[PDB]
A paper describes a structure:
We report an in silico strategy for the biocatalytic synthesis of chiral N- and O-heterocycles via Baldwin cyclization modes of hydroxy- and amino-substituted epoxides and oxetanes using the limonene epoxide hydrolase from [name]. We turned to cofactor-independent limonene epoxide hydrolases (LEHs) that normally catalyze direct hydrolysis of epoxides by positioning and activating water at the active site. On the basis of the well-documented mechanism of ReLEH, a water molecular is positioned by H-bonds to N55 and Y53 while D132 abstracts a proton from the water, enabling a smooth nucleophilic attack on one of the substrate’s epoxide carbon center. We have rationally engineered the epoxide hydrolase ReLEH with construction of a general platform for Baldwin cyclization reactivity of hydroxy- and amino-epoxides and oxetanes.
To further elucidate the mechanism, crystallographic experiments were performed. SZ611 assembles into a homodimer structure with four α-helices and five-strand β-sheets in each monomer, forming a cavity that serves as a deep substrate-binding pocket, in which a substituent of substrate 59 or of product 46 can occur without steric repulsion. The electron density map of such ligands and surrounding key residues were defined with good quality. A major portion of substrate 59 was clearly defined in the electron density map, apart from a minor portion of the phenyl group. In the catalytic reactions, residue D132 acts as a proton acceptor to promote the deprotonation of the amino group. For the desymmetric oxetane reactions, we propose a putative catalytic pathway, which mainly includes the following crucial processes: (1) deprotonation of the amine group; (2) nucleophilic attack of carbon atom (C2) of the oxetane; (3) protonation of oxygen atom of oxetane.
Residue numbers in the entry:
A (entry chain A): 7 to 12, 15 to 148
B (entry chain B): 4 to 147
The structure:
Amino acid sequence: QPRWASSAAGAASTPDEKIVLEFMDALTSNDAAKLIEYFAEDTMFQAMPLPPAYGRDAVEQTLAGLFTVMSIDAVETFHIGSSNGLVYTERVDVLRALPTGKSYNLSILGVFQLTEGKITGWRDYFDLREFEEAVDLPLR
Amino acid sequence: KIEQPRWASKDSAAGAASTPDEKIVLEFMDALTSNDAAKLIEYFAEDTMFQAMPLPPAYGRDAVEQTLAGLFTVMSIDAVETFHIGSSNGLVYTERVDVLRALPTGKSYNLSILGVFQLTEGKITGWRDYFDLREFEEAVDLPL
Ligand SMILES: NCCC1(c2ccccc2)COC1
Ligand SMILES: NCCC1(c2ccccc2)COC1
Ligand code: NA
Ligand code: NA
Ligand code: NA
């Protein structure tokens, strides 16, 4: 739990913020076929250290690939807010490398674009090397 | 001036500062290009922190100033291009690219960043930038 955590900062206060929180909970399913139901047809996803994926088919394939070697065991959201149809989440994802069994608390700032309650864009910003060295698994 | 990302929101409001706090942050982003820690620190409260998230945090105004000064001895911020800015609950979020030049190696890199700023009574109580450090290091041939 970060020293720098802000009162309503951690509350989801709009429908879009609430759907993003629900999506963060669904991520622990590690199930890309289930998670793709949250995305619009016109959509994209990027873990920013890695190449982007555009459209539902490429996004589902990208997520499925990540889930073959890592489990999202928990998502803890410290701050959530929104302006202009974008939702921002400052969080830690607890990521477990399946090959090694090691876990790591990865600090993430992510952004979600939503239209009519569906994700039109999801980008997470973080440092990939610190995750790789912690769990003994390169990902690039 | 940087190419607009394919994923950038077309809603004009998404890229504009719409609140007093967001306007402070946009001015602060312009000030980054002066590469002067003493100029930047005037925007910070005494109860404050800074962290480039791949690197250790600094707490308090003096430690923040010294960390900023130390970063500016090794890199220059030549431009900042903000694509999205938004805010809730006293926090401002900026999705942007910082054009970062490594002074020892004379190479530059367009670093994709999502950053968060906490403001209290118009002063920065926290500033954390999230990005991948390794891709910057490899682009400019500067380990750390
Ligand atoms: N940041 C986007 C990638 C993350 C992920 C997604 C699917 C499977 C594993 C890991 C979410 O935080 C790591
Ligand atoms: N990411 C946070 C650190 C940055 C910086 C700040 C001051 C001096 C040099 C570099 C902002 O983008 C790089
Ligand atoms: Na909030
Ligand atoms: Na807002
Ligand atoms: Na905006």
